[PDB]
Design an enzyme around this catalytic site. Structure first.
Site, PDB file in Angstrom:
ATOM      1  N   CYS A 173       0.813  -1.219   0.000  1.00  0.00           N
ATOM      2  CA  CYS A 173       0.000   0.000   0.000  1.00  0.00           C
ATOM      3  C   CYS A 173       0.847   1.270   0.000  1.00  0.00           C
ATOM      4  O   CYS A 173       2.001   1.255  -0.420  1.00  0.00           O
ATOM      5  CB  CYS A 173      -0.993   0.038   1.167  1.00  0.00           C
ATOM      6  SG  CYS A 173      -0.370   0.570   2.755  1.00  0.00           S
TER       7      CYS A 173
ATOM      8  N   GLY B 164      -0.228   7.768  -5.885  1.00  0.00           N
ATOM      9  CA  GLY B 164      -0.435   6.338  -5.720  1.00  0.00           C
ATOM     10  C   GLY B 164      -0.331   5.583  -7.030  1.00  0.00           C
ATOM     11  O   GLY B 164       0.197   4.467  -7.068  1.00  0.00           O
TER      12      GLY B 164
ATOM     13  N   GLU C  18      -2.845  -5.818  -0.669  1.00  0.00           N
ATOM     14  CA  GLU C  18      -3.140  -6.191   0.709  1.00  0.00           C
ATOM     15  C   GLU C  18      -4.461  -6.945   0.774  1.00  0.00           C
ATOM     16  O   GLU C  18      -5.386  -6.669   0.006  1.00  0.00           O
ATOM     17  CB  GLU C  18      -3.205  -4.957   1.612  1.00  0.00           C
ATOM     18  CG  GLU C  18      -1.881  -4.270   1.869  1.00  0.00           C
ATOM     19  CD  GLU C  18      -2.003  -3.124   2.848  1.00  0.00           C
ATOM     20  OE1 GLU C  18      -3.142  -2.780   3.225  1.00  0.00           O
ATOM     21  OE2 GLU C  18      -0.957  -2.576   3.253  1.00  0.00           O
TER      22      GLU C  18
ATOM     23  N   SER D 261      -7.772  -1.164   2.439  1.00  0.00           N
ATOM     24  CA  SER D 261      -7.135   0.116   2.683  1.00  0.00           C
ATOM     25  C   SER D 261      -8.137   1.205   2.335  1.00  0.00           C
ATOM     26  O   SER D 261      -8.947   1.055   1.420  1.00  0.00           O
ATOM     27  CB  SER D 261      -5.843   0.272   1.881  1.00  0.00           C
ATOM     28  OG  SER D 261      -5.276   1.549   2.104  1.00  0.00           O
TER      29      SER D 261
END
EC number: 2.3.1.48
Lengths: 81, 97, 108, 96, 272, 97, 93
Positions: free
Chosen positions: E145, E158, E179, E183
């Protein structure tokens, strides 16, 4: 100990293991697809291996049970136990 | 140092191995192979020697079957090497999965 | 309101007397629990659904209302999820999937 | 002049999954041949592995094993989810 | 009941106010100061203010110290060699556990070489992107992340850190995952992540190729490609990784490859 | 006159079989031939008619499996037709005697 | 149960030419095929006598079992001595 390492890099055994049948001169690039086909076949036999082991309810594996699984996938490697 | 033509020496090594019946892949290599493919999708479990020996027996028999008929598919195309399109045509004629 | 165990004591829709009958007709030894075995009703329910939901899938694709067999073979070769469940899939007058190969077309 | 049939429960479950469609007779016969042969192979290996475990009575753990080992992984996770859910439901056999 | 209480004072980075996210096992001295005055150069903290000028008279280091791997025309890319660079991993991990919930300093957070991302001007660098991994093959897990400074989000940092991770997945040829649980911005952002790789995955062919290949050049195999096939709205494809097909769709945001998707990085990097 | 390539019967006949799944082989000659091969092992057999339908689509299924694999085995070797080595390699890979 | 066939395998190999020897490990191979084609003829005999719903399994269904799986030549001389030995039980009263 239990850590993941890569045994997919098995050994280049196929340049003698394809030397079990009438493989002529070889010319290569087969290493990755012979790697893919044998990893598919071993994962196919090992998930029903562990399937009988959880139906065995004990945390080893054994040979009569592996030949039970081995014929139930059809690819019955006959005759070991 | 006199060693003549390559290629028919391939044929005498052909007959050299298929006279013999030794278990052709190496032991602790398949040991670490089958542990490190089994331990991941289902958790920590233990093996027995005769069972693991028989399962690489299965592995040998299946893959020797697939490369001999891969050889037949390769010599279909009038050609003596082994190349990938032979292999995947062999896998597909053999019942895809 | 009712004093009758109305055969769906889980809440499923296949006949459980037929399941007791099919378990005591495969019938190897002599004592075989017919009380627990609604956990095979649930598997024949799950693939009632795992064919009839893609029946409903290709029901739009042919603009019918009546479900039939060639659409059954296109759903029997929906996908690798269900090719392998019926490894030999050939149903009666099923035909085949449409397939030309990339080989023959060369803009000639 | 007396035959066990499968088609009745089949058409009621077809009409409840999807509401509004029709069926056909030979397609009725192809899916009832499908349902009895999938029962056939689960039953055969159920008896086979309740034989080779040296255990004497057929059990739900045994057939959850059976349905895991016969059908592939997508419908494996499906069928085990409603296996546990169905046994949750019929196990819950109370007065209400 | 203890490990998730909003405990500190607040964040005031120089003149810029940022309120926090969650707990970390504080020395309560930082809470006792009303500030978290971080450094604009090498990110250190203590118990006063007019000792923020002992480094301003002392400053010879003003960026993360270890291996600067890359700068494009836009931002620098970086790795911390944090075996004995636990000292930079100090203020890495304290800022992380200011803003990173799920792992905890119950172990000590050495064992990976952490990937950082700044941008120098002529005055010097400012951390504009960061996270870590572990060594190899935990649960797959290529996609890891985000970290970002709390004031230049919502524009594509990002995107740039994940294409960074994508190239370094390409030069490791290892397949992983995001993940597992969640998130916060990470969900719909990751939808966008496989979305723009998906438009660069269905545009460039005009025909249909096999799907492990389109599980290849973005390195996301059969746990990702299914919700590529279905979670853009519904793309009925005769499901199966033997082949599915692709089709003409709206392509409307593909008709807008001009805003916030205009720049990327060529594969010019070093390996491990 | 309008005329277009011998060999371009391909795609229009592709759809022309492919839309319909009706049974290809003509029925009562096929009844005659299965009756004749059956008639020389045991006497007085009849057929039930849906049994003829069953064995009819059995031979339909097994033949479409046969030349679908000879189709892609022919394209395995840069070839445009099927010929006799193609079907003979199919009958190598069949596995059933 | 601990129960094999290998002694009867050994008596058979003696009522061949008695000159050879049973090897150390092929008797496991012999055991595995005798019980697996035993079990599969048992499976097919079970359901083939189950399709006429007749209660026992007996003579007609077993000779049709041991013809309907094993292939031609050994099948027909197999069923020849099948009839032979089953009469030879009844040869006495």
């Amino acid at each position: 100990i239990l850590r993941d390492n890569i045994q997919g890099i098995t050994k280049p055994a196929i340049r003698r293991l394809a030397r079990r049948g009438g493989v002529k001169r070889i010319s290569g690039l087969i290493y990755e697809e012979v790697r893919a086909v044998l990893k598919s076949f071993l994962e196919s036999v090992i998930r029903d291996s562990v399937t009988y082991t959880e139906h065995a309810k004990r945390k080893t594996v054994t040979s009569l049970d592996v030949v039970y699984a081995l014929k139930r996938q059809g690819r019955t490697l006959y005759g070991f136990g | 140092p006199h060693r003549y033509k390559p290629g028919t020496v391939a044929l005498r090594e052909i007959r050299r191995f298929q006279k013999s019946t030794e278990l052709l892949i190496r032991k602790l290599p398949f040991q670490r192979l089958v542990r490190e493919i089994a331990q991941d999708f289902k958790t920590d479990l233990r093996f027995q020697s005769s069972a693991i020996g028989a399962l690489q027996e299965s592995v040998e028999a299946y893959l020797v079957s697939l490369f001999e008929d891969t050889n037949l598919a390769a010599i279909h195309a009038k050609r003596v090497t082994i190349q990938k399109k032979d292999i995947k045509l062999a896998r597909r004629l053999r019942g895809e999965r | 309101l009712r004093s009758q165990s109305s055969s769906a004591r889980a809440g499923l829709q296949f006949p459980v007397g037929r399941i007791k009958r099919y378990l005591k007709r495969h019938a190897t030894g002599r004592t075989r629990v017919g009380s627990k075995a609604a956990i095979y009703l649930t598997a024949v329910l799950e693939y009632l659904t795992a064919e009839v939901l893609e029946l409903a899938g290709n029901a739009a694709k042919d603009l019918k209302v009546k479900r039939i067999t060639p659409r059954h073979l296109q759903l029997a070769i929906r996908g690798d999820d269900e090719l392998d469940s019926l490894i030999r899939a050939t149903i009666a007058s099923g035909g085949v999937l449409p397939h030309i190969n990339k080989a023959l077309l060369l803009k000639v | 002049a007396r035959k066990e049939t499968y088609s009745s429960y089949i058409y009621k479950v077809l009409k409840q999954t999807h509401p509004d469609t029709g069926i056909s007779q030979k397609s009725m016969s192809i899916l009832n041949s499908f349902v009895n042969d999938i029962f056939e192979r689960i039953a055969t290996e159920a008896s086979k592995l309740a034989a080779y475990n040296k255990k004497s009575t057929i059990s739900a753990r045994e057939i959850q094993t059976a349905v895991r080992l016969i059908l592939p992984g997508e419908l494996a996770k499906h069928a085990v989810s409603e296996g546990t859910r169905a046994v949750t439901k019929y196990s819950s056999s109370t007065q209400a | 009941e203890v490990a998730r209480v909003r405990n500190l004072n607040r964040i005031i980075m120089g003149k810029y106010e940022i309120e926090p996210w969650y707990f970390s096992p504080y020395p309560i001295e930082l809470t006792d100061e009303d500030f978290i005055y971080i450094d604009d150069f090498t990110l250190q903290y203590f118990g006063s203010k007019k000792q923020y000028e002992r480094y301003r008279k002392k400053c010879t280091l003003r960026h993360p110290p270890g291996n600067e791997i890359y700068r494009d025309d836009y931002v620098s890319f970086f790795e911390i060699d944090g075996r004995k660079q636990r000292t930079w991993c100090r203020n890495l991990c304290l800022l992380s556990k200011l803003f990173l919930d799920h792992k905890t300093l119950y172990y000590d957070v050495d064992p990976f070489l952490f990937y950082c991302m700044t941008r120098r001007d002529e005055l010097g660098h400012h951390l504009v992107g960061y996270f870590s991994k572990e060594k190899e093959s935990a649960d797959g897990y290529n996609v890891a992340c985000i970290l970002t400074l709390p004031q230049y989000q919502r524009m594509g940092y990002g995107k740039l850190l994940i294409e960074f991770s994508y190239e370094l997945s390409k030069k490791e040829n290892k397949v992983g995952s995001p993940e597992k649980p969640l998130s916060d911005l990470g969900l719909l952002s990751y939808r966008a992540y496989w979305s723009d790789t998906l438009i660069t995955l269905l545009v460039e062919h005009q025909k249909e190729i096999t799907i492990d290949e389109i599980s290849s050049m973005t390195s996301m195999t059969t746990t990702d490609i299914l919700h590529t096939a279905k979670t853009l709205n519904i793309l009925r494809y005769y499901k199966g990784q033997h082949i599915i097909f692709l089709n003409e769709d709206i392509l409307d945001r593909y008709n807008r490859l001009k805003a916030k998707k205009r720049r990327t990085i060529d594969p010019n990097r070093l390996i491990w």
